[PDB]
Amino acid sequence: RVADTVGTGPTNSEAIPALTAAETGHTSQVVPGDTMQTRHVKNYHSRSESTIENFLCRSACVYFTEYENSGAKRYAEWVLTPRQAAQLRRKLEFFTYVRFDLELTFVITSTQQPSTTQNQDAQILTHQIMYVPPGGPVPDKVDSYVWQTSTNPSVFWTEGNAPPRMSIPFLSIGNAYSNFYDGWSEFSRNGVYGINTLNNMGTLYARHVNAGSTGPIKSTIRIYFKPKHVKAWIPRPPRLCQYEKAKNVNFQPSGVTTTRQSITTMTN
């Protein structure tokens, strides 16, 4: 609940609430009843939508990719990294360090491709999604043994029902996920610079378990993140500039803001 205004009256004193000194790096805690006469107002507004948990706990698409039931591109791979979509990236970069659980949701949708093959009568498609932590083997092909998922987490989904969804705990060797890193991987102060140094999150693969039809089909998978139980530290200023790559903070210089006509104009 926000503070309630206190009613004040006329004053003639040596107190100076308005006069301050901003060189001390301190924000003035002046209320409106210090520079004018006010009335008593009973405020009932709540700050319940400005909480970091409410500001960040909403699903967002961070990536989508395609694969086919025939031909060359038979499976899809994606090193996990949220810095490909602009919206969630810009929301998180408000802080230097964060710490949250994750809620993953996948929207898998198929489409029939144009072709001249006849007598097509497709059976329901089943998809497999597999997570490989850094260090494990990778699926060089579509029908390789790695898809046995003896230890690797994986989800089997048949087209036509509720989208698959899982919960991931805070996976980090450190005490918090670093949104920014000012340093290198090597002690020789050369090599990889920036936050790509701390991006050791694993890889996600996706395939069709059966081909379904005799004609071509392309399946697209969209990945959705949703932070839970969020903690955050050291707020930073917003990006302002437009992002360029997913591994670094590079930008093109942009003006402070948009302009107007004069210093006295009340119009954009």
Partner: protein, 256 residues
């Protein structure tokens, strides 16, 4: 002893006396009061002019003829140029007030007729051209009354109000206007009609120039009649008193 016909109302430096009147109608059961602290929004301290603004302002008279469709007044606009009420509502940004409307019409025992007096909240009116919305010079005429019509207004490419009377300009049935606070002036019984409307709105305060909270409608359901030899000029007078008027947000004078 006393009678129910006689009644005096004192407000400011104004006293209204009547010797043949019906019971007073008090809004929706509510008496106009001031805005409380648990219901306010604007933080600064408001100014209450009291006697200078809460008094009886009389408007021009209109003539009741044998073929008069009816009249209406946008209450806030009607007094926007009278005394210190208009000045306070011209120098401030937000305002809040209730009203006390007294409508008077006197005639003899050989005259007949019946007038409906209704305070309509948020009487949004319609245009004669479906394409556009009506002008402010058509909707609100200050220092005067706005007349209804007996026939529908023609269409075209203008911004005229659909002043047909049996539709009340609001596109309803006129006989249902008795759902709002109302009073009948019957020449054989009544003489005047009093209505004490409180502040109705969906916000705690409002700008008083670009929004009209209520509207006074006077319609003669039964026409005026008499026999040759009696008085032919019969006027109708309207007196409005603001009640518990307060103002917030002092600024420069003007309405733009």
């Amino acid at each position: 002893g006393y009678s129910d016909r006689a009644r005096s109302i004192t407000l400011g430096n104004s006293t209204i006396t009547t010797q043949e009147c019906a019971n007073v109608v008090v809004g929706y059961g509510v008496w106009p009061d001031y805005l409380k602290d648990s219901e306010a929004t604007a933080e600064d301290q408001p100014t209450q002019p009291d006697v200078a603004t809460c008094r009886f302002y009389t408007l021009d008279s209109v003539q009741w003829q044998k073929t008069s469709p009816g009249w209406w007044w946008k209450l806030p606009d009607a007094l926007s140029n009278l005394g210190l009420f208009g000045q306070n509502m011209q120098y401030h940004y937000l305002g809040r007030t209730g009203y006390t409307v007294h409508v008077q019409c006197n005639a003899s025992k050989f005259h007949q007729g019946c007038l409906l007096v209704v305070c309509v909240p948020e009487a949004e009116m319609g245009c004669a051209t479906l394409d556009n919305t009506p002008s402010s010079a058509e909707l609100l005429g200050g220092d005067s009354a706005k007349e209804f019509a007996d026939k529908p207004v023609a269409s075209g490419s203008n911004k005229l109000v659909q002043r047909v009377v049996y539709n009340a300009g609001m596109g309803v049935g006129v006989g249902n206007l008795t759902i709002f606070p109302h009073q009948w002036i019957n020449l054989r019984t009544n003489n005047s009609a009093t209505i004490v409307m409180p502040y109705t709105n969906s916000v705690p305060m409002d700008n008083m120039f670009r929004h009209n909270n209520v509207t006074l409608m006077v319609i003669p359901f039964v026409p005026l009649d008499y026999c040759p030899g009696s008085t032919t000029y019969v006027p109708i007078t309207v007196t409005i008193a603001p009640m518990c008027a307060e103002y917030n947000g002092l600024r420069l004078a003007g309405h733009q």
